[PDB]
Design a protein around this ligand. Structure first.
Ligand SMILES: CCCCCCCCCCCCCCCCCC(=O)OC[C@H](CO[C@@H]1O[C@H](CO[C@H]2O[C@H](CO)[C@H](O)[C@H](O)[C@H]2O)[C@H](O)[C@H](O)[C@H]1O)OC(=O)CCCCCCCCCCCCCCCCC
Ligand SMILES: CCCCCCCCCCCCCCCCCC(=O)OC[C@H](CO[C@@H]1O[C@H](CO[C@H]2O[C@H](CO)[C@H](O)[C@H](O)[C@H]2O)[C@H](O)[C@H](O)[C@H]1O)OC(=O)CCCCCCCCCCCCCCCCC
Ligand code: CLA
Ligand code: CLA
Ligand code: CLA
Ligand code: CLA
Ligand code: CLA
Ligand SMILES: CCCCCCCCCCCCCCCCCC(=O)OC[C@H](CO[C@@H]1O[C@H](CO)[C@H](O)[C@H](O)[C@H]1O)OC(=O)CCCCCCCCCCCCCCCCC
Ligand SMILES: CC1=C(/C=C/C(C)=C/C=C/C(C)=C/C=C/C=C(C)/C=C/C=C(C)/C=C/C2=C(C)CCCC2(C)C)C(C)(C)CCC1
Ligand SMILES: CC1=C(/C=C/C(C)=C/C=C/C(C)=C/C=C/C=C(C)/C=C/C=C(C)/C=C/C2=C(C)CCCC2(C)C)C(C)(C)CCC1
Ligand SMILES: CCCCCCCCCCCCO[C@@H]1O[C@H](CO)[C@@H](O[C@H]2O[C@H](CO)[C@@H](O)[C@H](O)[C@H]2O)[C@H](O)[C@H]1O
Ligand code: OEX
Ligand SMILES: [Ca+2]
Ligand SMILES: [Cl-]
Ligand SMILES: [Cl-]
Lengths: 334, 119, 32, 37, 60, 95, 450, 36, 243
């Protein structure tokens, strides 16, 4: 009736090709802002003094990077955790030199992904669905927040956020291992279980369904045309898939309830990713992976090495070289 | 409960007496002139700086002292610290008159504290 | 010494106390 | 440490804090005794 | 001073007895006639025990 | 082509303690030098010759005697600003 | 209430959902859980007291509850040295005994007490839809929380005071006599940017502000309690919110997630409500301390730390912040917002003052910087202190690290719980929490997207 | 810069106000199930 | 500056501003014929930066071009201590002794070229003309100062080449490793010329203020490329201890 009611009816309309929703009214502007800035900066941003030592790092394609090496470089260590919007720079050139694009992109991206998760809930509510797809989505969001927000906060600088680039991601990872021994952190072990197992279960479920497809096609056409969109009849034989799998391992290890099976498929990677996100978030406070350096001593008291000591050698090698000009004092505390 | 000064008990007091004597000399010399010059920043820096161990040292005086002079010394040190806190408050608000008042208070209570010092 | 021994005795008595409560309720027919 | 009169039960205070873990376990024990109805 | 230790050990023994009995007493409606007074009694005694210990803390 | 420090390591600077280029850590092997006498020597550099290390203004008799005992370990080379700038003779980033 | 799936519709692993409409049983569960909380407080305190070496600092001994008691001004004196171990013991005992009582009451209500309370009393009986009764319970609890805030205030004012790490003459337990009631400061804390150098409420740096903010919190909470006892929710609130037990749970879960995040940050950054005397240095403090330690050492060696440039051309020991202030050089440039009682005597209006650095540095400051640098909140999961590449001989993990990590994890999982319950509460109110009804599948009445 | 700051503040305030007032606008009733 | 606290100064940029004396100030500081007076808190605030661009043509005027500072309010020398000695004839000699007497500064030029330079007053000796029996508005201390290499000898380039540390060659290309001129790092000690024109003397408090203009070389990046000429214009303040 009223103009406001009509606007509300429009934003919450399930007939829009892309659902907008109230969370969308924040998602769309912030995500477009982050995207526009990201594209512009990745292509054309000048070098950024990430370490705050006036040693700018070229991230953009126009300054000699390829796609693999290019990045939006995190803001300067001199900035630390300070808010550095465009209007706090004396000039755009200053803002760029100190890595302002990184902050702009990251803050808008994070707002956008949280609004994306809210929007998933909102649309499920408008469609009369159950509400928990957004809960599964909270795992990737948690990981992204850990690497772009929580870790820089614990470490005291956005300079220590993950760079927005491929090689920058690898650099982040290597230094993270050197400083926190993430490989020897059980939460990362759980994340690895999450992703390895999620891929295993994806392959297993896809293969069992594909194996038990009901014959509805010929050998010439794709078997995919055997399924018609919106049929209630089941397109595969779950009992035959259960027969196969319960004979592959043993009967009681195989799901015969599709609902429990799909709950397990959802829950396993999501829980693993939550755990690895929490691992990164707690190593943000320097609660690091296990340290078994010199755990095994011989009877005299000489150290007997283990694979943990070899790993520590690799970590030291990474550590002594990273940010080679940034350290003035013997302990890498900050 | 010897309740009497001795050659050896005095030397165990000296390890705290030296810092407190240096602190009192500084309080007479530098802090007074910092307050007189209306220099609140340096006043706060002095009372949190060279004085930043006064409570510990002077309670080591008090608790390791005569049974008669233990509670008295503790109370006198507490009064000194209260005046020091009011000094900090007056310096933070740029209150010269109140600052000089609290300075005289703290200095007099410090003199009263050092009065019950053997030798 | 005996500190681990005493500690383990306390721990074991505690460990039994809960399951003992449940087992007694189950066997004597109390509500569960 | 504990004041002197209480160090006969030092080894009990050593194990007291983990008790709520046992309560969480006891919930499952109780559900197992009822067959997880 | 040994009386303090005895009271402490008594309080721990009666706390163990209470930890065992209380859930059974509340979870047996049939034997609630004779376990409702016991409850009362035991609680009072446990309360008394605590009081004794507290007093003995300042006596020892 | 050696830059300038490597050419320094070619000279006596690379064989013994140079009073005009050596870091303060390099005096640690001289018993009684680190840190006080070593700091004094570095402060009162440069020296044209080794013997004027004995002419440091304000020196003390025990320090004098230590310098005379350890004269043999000293050399004087032209002060290379690479080893001198930034107070690197005190802290060259080595821990 | 049923106690199995056929008569409740909930499996055993969701069995507590069976309590949603059994008000007496739910009260029993809550009281028993409160007993668990108080029990842990008491038992953990007794454990920490037993495992306490009172002349070794608290933060070196894996203690998280004793620092809370010390900060409140119990059992500690100047520089935080433990005077009387008995107050820690009494706090632990009192919690343990009251935990026994709470557990007994929770067990009574959960196992024998009346199943529902509504037909026994109107006062304690409640219905989740009873907006007036729900706001009454909010009001009673708001009054209680205001009382607790004023309890903190009373301890700081009239019952021995609190530990002031900023105390002149050295950090000490002092009585706060002039709390700031000035609403400008109190509520401008809440308006400060949550970013570097501002630190929204994490930046509160004096016990006067803390105590005055708690006076304000007490008044706000009590007035809100009375407000909610005497009113019912307005139309706007009734139209915007979901009114159900699971909805109220979800709202509280969101609140708890926010609080957990805030506490993790608070313990990580704030050294006023978490004095470094009991909690050890913050990470920022430790980095600054290392810079200070080597400034002092190289200065004693003869380095002119004012004019020494490092390899990059920035000052080795001193440099300018982007706003011009004189700060420690090196990577610790990121931590120039740090303020601590051992460093502020050397800070002038422009930042670090060359004159104080050259002739005002005290031996206690040198000792403190060494201690804080060597207790940087860095450590392995198996409690090996230092940087991760160090060897096994230093058994230390900062209490700040334990608290911050644990509370960040709890905050996140309570955000997840909030999402779960908010989504479920909405779906249940709209009636599709059990799946799509085949007859009335909404998408089937919707036009095709393209 | 100040023009930018004011403009961004206006834009952000309008978007936040939209979101808030939308969710206040009887949002639980905008569903295909029950309206109570 | 003024008379506030670090709390009032923090994050304002005021920490980078050199204190100023007053407006009704035309005093003079009488000086003994042959005695030296300490200078306590000497501050230099740069405001204008020009880089002498190098034409490819030849033989043509280079035309200093105005640059813009990419580094933030980190450009000021302060807390500098020095001395002024009054010559036998009457000459005034300012000698910088120490303090925060350097700042790395990067300026952007039109065309996208970035010019780092080591803005400093290190070991500045400056003199006036003879016949000065006072410090006044005509006191112009013209002198020289040293400019250390922007990067120290401990700096490592992106391929970990350095002067007293790092590789002496291009290790990523084993068969061409010794082929690169940048395999040899240098840190030459450059020369700058400074002039401090005193414009305002408060003889009672001892404060002098004025304008300064300095000319120096820019970063060579360990001798990788030729130094540009950077001119800096700004203001200065100091306190002269009369007693
Ligand atoms: C619904 C509402 C949503 C609202 C959104 C608005 C934004 C929220 C998040 C803010 C993001 C801040 C980023 C930078 C944080 C920071 O600079 O640092 C942290 C700040 C505190 O700031 C610090 O505060 C410090 C205060 O200490 C100062 O004062 C102290 C006094 O003792 C000491 O003296 C100390 O030495 C001195 O420096 C200093 O000022 C530091 O410079 C300053 O950075 O926290 C704070 O202000 C705020 C607390 C932040 C909480 C942590 C984020 C929560 C993340 C959740 C992710 C979940 C994901 C789930 C996915 C699914
Ligand atoms: C598939 C299979 C996979 C499963 C495999 C088996 C897994 C089982 C489940 C986990 C088992 C827990 C291990 C129990 C042993 C233990 O823990 O052992 C540790 C201790 C007992 O050992 C003692 O641990 C101490 C730990 O150091 C502490 O004490 C030291 C000495 O005083 C120092 O003070 C140090 O600073 C301080 O941290 C010392 O090492 C002692 O020497 C040692 O005896 O138990 C404790 O602490 C009790 C800890 C309980 C509370 C912990 C709270 C954690 C808070 C936040 C977590 C955040 C992130 C988690 C990341 C992951
Ligand atoms: C905020 C909670 C908290 C914090 C910060 C601490 C911190 C500390 N405790 Mg402690 N404790 C706690 C709760 C806590 N505790 C509880 C609830 C108990 C009862 C069991 C105890 C009983 C206890 C004892 C007996 C001891 C400690 C000790 C310590 C110190 C050593 C820590 C350590 O090495 O553990 C090791 C770390 C681990 C074992 C890892 C735990 C990881 C858990 C499982 C994370 C769970 C993840 C997630 C929440 C799962 C659910 C999510 C789901 C959706 C999947 C340290 C300061 C020790 C000490 O030094 O005493 C002075 C010590 O001896 N605590
Ligand atoms: C804090 C944890 C907690 C609490 C307070 C409760 C509380 C409750 N749950 Mg429960 N639950 C929990 C965790 C908890 N649960 C967990 C982790 C699971 C998953 C395994 C479940 C799964 C579950 C199911 C499936 C059901 C409940 C139900 C109930 C209610 C009835 C209890 C009952 O009759 O069973 C009786 C059990 C006993 C009588 C065994 C003895 C228990 C006593 C209290 C042990 C106390 C020992 C203690 C040391 C003694 C101290 C006494 C004194 C001296 C201090 C009750 C209010 C039921 C319900 O909802 O009712 C409608 C129900 O069907 N829960
Ligand atoms: C929030 C916690 C809580 C709540 C809401 C209730 C609520 C209720 N209880 Mg229960 N109870 C509790 C905790 C709680 N209890 C605990 C911890 C115990 C162990 C001691 C008990 C043991 C218990 C028994 C044995 C019985 C009840 C009964 C009842 C019901 C009747 C109340 C009544 O009229 O008596 C009158 C209320 C008063 C006389 C007011 C007294 C207030 C307390 C006792 C004094 C202290 C006040 C304190 C200063 C306030 C703040 C507390 C402080 C710790 C912060 C009622 C629904 C009775 C029942 O179910 O009837 C059928 C009943 O048989 N309770
Ligand atoms: C835990 C304590 C508590 C709880 C659960 C409630 C709960 C409630 N109160 Mg409330 N209240 C409290 C304490 C509490 N109150 C206290 C202590 C006071 C005294 C100041 C009040 C005074 C009060 C008034 C005057 C009113 C309520 C009302 C309400 C009802 C609806 C309000 C609402 O939608 O919330 C959420 C708030 C909104 C939806 C408005 C938007 C607020 C902004 C935009 C949120 C932004 C916050 C920001 C993102 C977080 C950053 C932190 C900080 C920087 C701000 C609700 C049931 C209303 C009511 O129904 O009256 C009976 C009402 O008018 N209360
Ligand atoms: C105050 C907080 C709170 C409260 C009162 C509830 C209450 C409830 N929840 Mg909920 N939840 C919460 C927080 C809370 N939740 C949080 C933070 C999350 C995010 C993880 C969830 C996610 C969640 C889900 C997915 C579900 C519920 C459900 C429920 C209902 C039944 C749950 C049950 O029986 O438990 C039974 C208890 C168990 C099965 C034991 C769980 C053990 C956990 C997974 C591991 C414990 C780890 C812990 C750190 C200890 C480590 C041990 C280590 C030593 C090895 C119930 C009303 C159910 C529901 O929706 O009902 C309608 C349901 O499906 N909740
Ligand atoms: C349920 C009810 C439980 C009890 C409720 C409160 C009881 C606490 C009273 C103790 C007051 C101290 C008396 C002695 C004294 O004055 O100080 C004696 C000592 C030292 O305290 C000194 O008191 C002096 C009195 O003017 C001065 O204030 C000194 O500054 C101060 O140091 O206090 C203690 O050792 C007691 C520590 C206080 C701990 C009480 C809090 C824990 C109890 C509640 C938690 C249980 C909650 C269950 C749920
Ligand atoms: C309901 C239910 C449940 C739960 C339960 C609960 C939650 C509980 C609780 C409870 C509690 C919470 C308790 C308690 C207790 C306590 C006690 C029993 C005590 C005591 C005492 C004593 C004896 C002490 C002693 C001492 C002292 C005095 C001091 C010194 C030391 C000592 C220790 C010696 C479950 C889950 C199972 C399931 C089923 C249902
Ligand atoms: C004590 C203290 C202090 C103080 C503090 C204070 C004073 C406070 C406060 C506070 C407050 C006073 C707060 C608050 C809050 C709020 C919130 C948190 C909210 C919200 C919201 C919401 C949640 C909403 C939602 C919604 C929307 C958005 C729309 C639709 C509907 C709904 C409801 C959904 C200080 C710092 C000084 C110091 C320290 C201590
Ligand atoms: C070393 C040998 C191997 C050790 C094995 C250890 C694991 C064994 C299983 C752990 C116990 C699980 O507990 C099992 O739960 C199931 C739920 O399906 C319940 O199953 C049972 O419930 C009740 C018992 O009260 C019976 O009336 C019912 O007919 C039966 O199905 C029982 O409670 C128990 O059989
Ligand atoms: O910034 Mn990037 O990583 Ca974090 O650890 Mn310290 O800082 Mn830097 O050195 Mn290693
Ligand atoms: Ca023990
Ligand atoms: Cl690197
Ligand atoms: Cl560093």
């Amino acid at each position: 009736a009223s103009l406001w009611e009509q606007f509300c009816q429009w934003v919450t309309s399930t007939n829009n090709r892309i659902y907008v929703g109230w969370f969308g009214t924040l998602m769309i502007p912030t995500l477009l802002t982050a995207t526009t800035c990201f594209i512009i900066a990745f292509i054309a941003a000048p070098p950024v003094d990430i370490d705050g030592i006036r040693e700018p790092v070229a991230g953009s394609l126009l300054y000699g990077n390829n796609i693999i090496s290019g990045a939006v470089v995190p803001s300067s260590n001199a900035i630390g955790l300070h808010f550095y919007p465009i209007w706090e720079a004396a000039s755009l050139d200053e803002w760029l030199y100190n890595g302002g694009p990184y902050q702009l992109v990251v803050f808008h991206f994070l707002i956008g992904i949280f609004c994306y998760m809210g929007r998933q809930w909102e649309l499920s509510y408008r469609l009369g669905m159950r509400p928990w797809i957004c809960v599964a989505y909270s795992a990737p969001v948690s990981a992204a927040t850990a690497v772009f927000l929580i870790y820089p906060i614990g470490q005291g600088s956005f300079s220590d956020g993950m760079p927005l680039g491929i090689s920058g991601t690898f650099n982040f990872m290597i230094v993270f291992q050197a400083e926190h021994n993430i490989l020897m952190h059980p939460f990362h072990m759980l994340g690895v279980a999450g992703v390895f197992g999620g891929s295993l279960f994806s392959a297993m479920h896809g293969s069992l369904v594909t194996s038990s497809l009901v014959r509805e096609t010929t050998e010439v056409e794709s078997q995919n045309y055997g399924y018609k969109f919106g049929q209630e009849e089941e397109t595969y034989n779950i009992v035959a898939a259960h027969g196969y799998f319960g004979r592959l391992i043993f009967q009681y290890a195989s799901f015969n309830n599709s609902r429990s099976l799909h709950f397990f498929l959802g829950a396993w990677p999501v829980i693993g990713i939550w755990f690895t996100a929490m691992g990164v978030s707690t190593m943000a406070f320097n609660l690091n992976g296990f340290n078994f350096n010199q755990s095994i001593l011989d009877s005299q008291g000489r150290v007997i090495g283990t694979w943990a000591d070899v790993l520590n050698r690799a970590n030291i090698g990474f550590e002594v070289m990273h940010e080679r000009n940034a350290h003035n004092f013997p302990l890498d505390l900050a | 409960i010897p309740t009497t000064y001795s050659p050896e008990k005095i030397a165990q007091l000296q390890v705290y007496v030296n810092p407190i004597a240096v602190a009192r000399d500084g309080m007479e010399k530098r802090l007074q002139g910092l307050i007189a010059d209306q220099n609140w920043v340096d006043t706060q820096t002095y009372i949190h700086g060279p004085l930043g161990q006064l409570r510990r040292d002077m309670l080591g005086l008090a608790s390791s002292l005569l049974p008669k002079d233990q509670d008295k010394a503790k109370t006198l040190a507490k009064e000194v610290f209260g005046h020091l806190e009011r000094l900090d408050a007056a310096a933070k608000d740029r209150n010269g008159s109140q600052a000089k008042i609290q300075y005289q208070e703290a200095l007099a209570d410090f003199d009263s504290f050092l009065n019950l010092l053997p030798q | 010494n005996l500190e681990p021994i005493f500690q383990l005795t306390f721990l074991g008595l505690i460990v039994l106390a809960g399951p003992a409560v449940v087992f007694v309720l189950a066997f004597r027919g109390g509500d569960l | 440490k504990l004041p002197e009169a209480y160090q006969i039960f030092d080894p009990l205070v050593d194990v007291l804090p983990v008790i709520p873990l046992f309560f969480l376990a006891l919930a499952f024990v109780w559900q197992a005794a009822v067959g997880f109805k | 001073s040994i009386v303090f230790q005895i009271a402490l050990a008594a309080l721990v023994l009666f706390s163990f007895v209470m930890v065992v009995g209380v859930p059974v007493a509340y979870a047996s409606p049939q034997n609630w006639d004779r376990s409702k007074p016991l409850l009362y009694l035991g609680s009072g005694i446990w309360a008394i025990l605590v009081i004794v210990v507290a007093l003995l803390n300042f006596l020892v | 082509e050696l830059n300038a420090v490597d050419a320094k390591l070619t000279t006596d600077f690379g064989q013994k303690i140079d009073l005009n280029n050596s870091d303060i850590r390099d005096f640690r092997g001289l018993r009684g030098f680190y840190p006080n006498l070593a700091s004094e020597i570095i402060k009162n550099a440069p020296y044209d010759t080794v013997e004027e290390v004995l002419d440091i203004p304000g020196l003390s008799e025990t320090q004098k005697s230590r310098l005379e005992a350890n004269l043999g370990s000293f050399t004087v080379t032209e002060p290379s600003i690479e080893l001198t700038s930034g107070d690197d003779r005190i802290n060259p980033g080595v821990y | 209430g049923g106690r199995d799936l056929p008569s409740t519709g909930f499996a055993w692993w969701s069995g507590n959902a069976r309590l949603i409409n059994l008000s007496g049983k739910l009260l029993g569960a809550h009281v028993a859980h409160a007993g668990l909380i108080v029990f842990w407080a008491g038992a953990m305190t007794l454990f920490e007291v037993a495992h306490f070496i009172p002349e070794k600092p608290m933060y070196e001994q894996g203690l998280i509850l004793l620092p809370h008691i010390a900060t409140l001004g119990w059992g500690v004196g100047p520089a935080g040295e433990v005077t009387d171990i008995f107050p820690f013991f009494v706090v632990g005992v009192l919690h343990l005994i009251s935990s026994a009582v709470l557990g007994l009451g929770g067990i009574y209500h959960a196992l024998r007490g009346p199943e529902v309370l509504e037909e026994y009393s109107s006062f304690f009986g409640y219905d989740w839809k009873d907006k007036n009764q729900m706001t009454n319970i909010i009001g009673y609890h708001l009054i209680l929380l205001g009382c607790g805030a004023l309890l903190l205030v009373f301890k700081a004012m009239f019952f021995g005071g609190v530990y002031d790490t900023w105390a002149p003459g050295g950090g000490d337990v002092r009585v706060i006599t002039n709390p700031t009631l000035n609403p400008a400061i109190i509520f401008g804390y809440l308006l400060k940017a949550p970013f570097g150098g501002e630190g929204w409420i994490i930046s509160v740096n004096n016990m006067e502000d803390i105590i005055g903010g708690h006076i304000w919190i007490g008044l706000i909470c009590i007035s809100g309690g009375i407000w909610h006892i005497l009113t019912k929710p307005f139309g706007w609130a009734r139209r915007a919110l979901i009114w159900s037990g699971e909805a109220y749970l979800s709202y509280s879960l969101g609140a708890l997630s926010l609080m957990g995040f805030i506490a993790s940050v608070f313990v990580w950054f704030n050294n006023t409500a978490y004095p470094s005397e009991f909690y050890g240095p913050t990470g920022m403090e430790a980095s600054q301390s290392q810079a200070f330690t080597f400034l002092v050492r190289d200065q004693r060696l003869g380095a002119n730390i004012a004019s020494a440039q490092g390899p990059t051309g920035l000052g080795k020991y001193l440099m300018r912040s982007p706003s011009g202030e004189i700060i420690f050089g090196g990577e610790t440039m990121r931590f120039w917002d740090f303020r601590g009682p051992w460093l502020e005597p050397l800070r002038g209006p422009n930042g670090l003052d060359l004159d104080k650095l050259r002739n005002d540095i005290q031996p206690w400051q040198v000792r403190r910087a060494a201690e804080y640098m060597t207790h940087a909140p860095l450590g392995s999961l198996n409690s090996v202190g230092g940087v991760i590449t160090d060897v096994n001989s230093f058994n230390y993990v900062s209490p700040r690290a334990w608290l911050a990590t644990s509370h960040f994890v709890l905050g996140f999982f309570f955000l997840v719980g909030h999402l779960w319950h908010a989504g479920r509460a909405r779906a249940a109110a709209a009636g599709f929490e059990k799946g799509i009804d085949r007859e009335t599948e909404p998408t089937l009445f919707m036009p095709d997207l393209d | 810069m100040l023009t930018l700051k004011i403009a961004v503040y206006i834009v952000v305030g309008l978007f936040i106000s939209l979101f808030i007032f939308g969710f206040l606008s009887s949002d639980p009733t905008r569903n295909p199930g029950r309206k109570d | 500056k003024s008379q506030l606290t670090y709390d009032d100064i923090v994050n304002t940029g005021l920490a980078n501003v050199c204190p100023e004396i007053s407006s009704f100030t035309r005093g003079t500081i009488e000086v003994e014929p042959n005695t030296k007076y300490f200078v306590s808190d000497f501050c230099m605030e740069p405001q204008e930066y020009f880089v002498k661009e190098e034409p490819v043509n030849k033989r043509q005027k280079a035309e200093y071009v105005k640059g813009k500072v990419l580094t933030r309010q980190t450009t000021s020398l302060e807390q500098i201590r020095g001395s002024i000695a009054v010559g036998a004839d009457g000459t005034l000699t300012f000698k910088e002794k120490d303090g925060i007497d350097f700042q790395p500064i990067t300026v952007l030029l039109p065309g996208g070229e970035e010019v780092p330079f080591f803005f400093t007053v290190k070991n500045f000796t400056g003199t006036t003309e003879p016949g000065f029996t006072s410090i006044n508005s005509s006191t112009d201390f013209v002198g020289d100062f040293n400019v250390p290499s922007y990067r120290g000898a401990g700096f490592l380039d992106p391929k970990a080449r350095g002067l007293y540390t790092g590789y002496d060659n291009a290790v990523a290309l084993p068969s061409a490793a010794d082929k690169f001129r940048t395999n040899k790092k240098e840190t030459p000690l450059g020369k700058g010329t400074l002039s401090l024109q005193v414009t305002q003397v408060d003889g009672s408090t001892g404060e002098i203020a004025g304008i300064f203009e300095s000319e120096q070389p820019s970063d060579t990046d360990l001798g990788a490329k030729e130094p540009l000429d950077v001119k800096v214009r700004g203001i200065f303040y100091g306190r002269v201890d009369t007693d």
